[PDB]
Amino acid sequence: NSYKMDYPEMGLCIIINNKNFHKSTGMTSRSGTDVDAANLRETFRNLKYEVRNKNDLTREEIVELMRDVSKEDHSKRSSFVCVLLSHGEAGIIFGTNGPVDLKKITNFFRGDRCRSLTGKPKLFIIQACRGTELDCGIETCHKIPVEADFLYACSTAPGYYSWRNSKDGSWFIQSLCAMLKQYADKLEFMHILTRVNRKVATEFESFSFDATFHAKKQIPCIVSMLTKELYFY
């Protein structure tokens, strides 16, 4: 009923942290993202993941990184974690010089394409916009599918902007790290992520001099194709 998490290694945690984008793209610098990346590094280090931080990657460097990691031998590793911190749109995360399709990235890890991860949880944690909607809130052959064992922990609902504080980091990553620190020794991962949903939904609200962007809310979106319960302990 739960994934085997007592392989010799918990696995890799790849963190792609895009802060500065090529001028020609017109994309703004993502102030606060270094806070997220540092928090994520410490959070996952404590969970015994082998963390690799990558900063300011082009669209082709992202693809090449993911391809290479998917070709590593993960036989001794329990799981795989990839964190993407960038601008985005529906289905898309941005490299510093242009977009990468998320499906292209995740496909490298399919059950038939990365055999040393077949049957093990593959977790993709994404802090990026998924569109431009704002939430105004309301007061008060084979044997297993190749798409199985993926979880996407998305920072925001489909179609919506995702919020990041330039001083504190992104709402979602702040909350995800806090909940993992507090509950990773107590709760199954889906229940941890539900607590993240509640923390983001209840404790954060945007403040802006621009009325269009002021007093806005956010709900993260858990997408699970997992087949077992996931415990980090």
Binding site: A128, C129, Y161, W163, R164, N165, S166
Partner: peptide, 4 residues
């Protein structure tokens, strides 16, 4: 607060 900023959007991504």
């Amino acid at each position: 607060d900023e959007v991504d």
